[PDB]
Design an enzyme around this catalytic site. Sequence first.
Site, short mmCIF file in Angstrom:
data_model
loop_
_atom_site.label_atom_id
_atom_site.label_comp_id
_atom_site.label_asym_id
_atom_site.label_seq_id
_atom_site.Cartn_x
_atom_site.Cartn_y
_atom_site.Cartn_z
N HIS A 40 0.85 -1.25 0.00
CA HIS A 40 0.00 0.00 0.00
C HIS A 40 0.90 1.32 0.00
O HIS A 40 0.43 2.44 -0.12
CB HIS A 40 -0.99 -0.05 1.26
N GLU A 52 19.00 7.07 8.89
CA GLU A 52 18.23 8.24 9.39
C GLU A 52 17.87 8.11 10.81
O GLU A 52 17.76 7.01 11.29
CB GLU A 52 16.83 8.42 8.65
N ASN A 54 16.78 11.64 12.62
CA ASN A 54 15.86 12.82 12.52
C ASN A 54 15.59 12.92 11.04
O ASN A 54 16.55 13.09 10.32
CB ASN A 54 16.57 14.07 13.00
N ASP A 84 -0.03 -7.83 1.63
CA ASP A 84 0.45 -6.40 1.64
C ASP A 84 1.97 -6.32 1.80
O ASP A 84 2.45 -5.95 2.86
CB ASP A 84 -0.20 -5.61 2.80
N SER A 172 0.98 0.99 16.37
CA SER A 172 1.63 1.63 15.21
C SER A 172 0.50 2.62 14.75
O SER A 172 -0.66 2.50 15.17
CB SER A 172 1.97 0.54 14.14
N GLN A 174 -0.46 5.84 11.40
CA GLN A 174 -0.04 6.28 10.03
C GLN A 174 1.27 7.03 10.06
O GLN A 174 1.56 7.86 10.90
CB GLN A 174 -1.10 7.16 9.33
N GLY A 175 2.03 6.68 9.08
CA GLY A 175 3.38 7.26 8.89
C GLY A 175 4.28 6.05 9.21
O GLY A 175 5.42 6.03 8.80
N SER A 177 3.42 2.87 8.39
CA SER A 177 3.16 1.90 7.29
C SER A 177 4.45 1.45 6.61
O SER A 177 5.31 2.28 6.37
CB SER A 177 2.31 2.52 6.18
N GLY A 178 4.50 0.17 6.34
CA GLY A 178 5.68 -0.44 5.65
C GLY A 178 6.89 -0.78 6.53
O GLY A 178 7.75 -1.52 6.08
CA LIG Z 1 18.65 12.93 9.17
MG LIG Z 2 8.01 2.36 10.01
#
Ligand SMILES: [Ca+2]
Ligand SMILES: [Mg+2]
Length: 223
Positions: A40, A52, A54, A84, A172, A174-175, A177-178
């Site tokens: 999705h 990563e 920040n 998914d 968890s 939204q944001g 996802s995955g």
């Molecule tokens: Ca960064």
């Molecule tokens: Mg994540």
Amino acid sequence: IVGGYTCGANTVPYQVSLNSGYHFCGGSLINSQWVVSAAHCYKSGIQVRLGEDNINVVEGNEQFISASKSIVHPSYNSNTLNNDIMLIKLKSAASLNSRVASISLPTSCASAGTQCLISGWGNTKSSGTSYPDVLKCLKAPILSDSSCKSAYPGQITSNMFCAGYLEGGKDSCQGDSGGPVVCSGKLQGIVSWGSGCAQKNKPGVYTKVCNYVSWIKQTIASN
Ligand SMILES: [Ca+2]
Ligand SMILES: [Mg+2]
């Protein structure tokens, strides 16, 4: 992630941020050339960001690599979210180091009761919107399929499992996802869907990766 904590910079070295001008999904690095995320999260024009912490500040350990190709599972159903899962190949290989590492695929499925680690840059309120800039973590156990199926009647397939707290409070959102759900050193799930975030008797639902290992291995070796 709601009710979780700040992971700490690069403590989840296999965590990826998918960016199409902004962060829109998480993913996991499985080797120098491939990433697994949720179907999705499919978009055209994805740049994968590794190392990563920040996501709004270049702190020095990042590698931003464009995707060369994306493969959504042949049976993904966007209506039920069954199957998914998607694979993303990087245009160049990542340089693995202490901050950028891959996660192992499982040899067997995990049992209910097993504690896992969920991570992401998603919403941190259950009722509200607060998007963090640093990676948040949440330890949560896999729940029995019985409690998962009673929460969502007629919606859970054998390609999904629930993890969380039926009392609510931690989940968890939204944001996220995955992103990854790692248990005992193996990638067992992918943040897929849920009903709101951290609501009572509404645990998050995860893609059950142990069911797609032959498809992942076959696909990456042929692409
Ligand atoms: Ca960064
Ligand atoms: Mg994540």
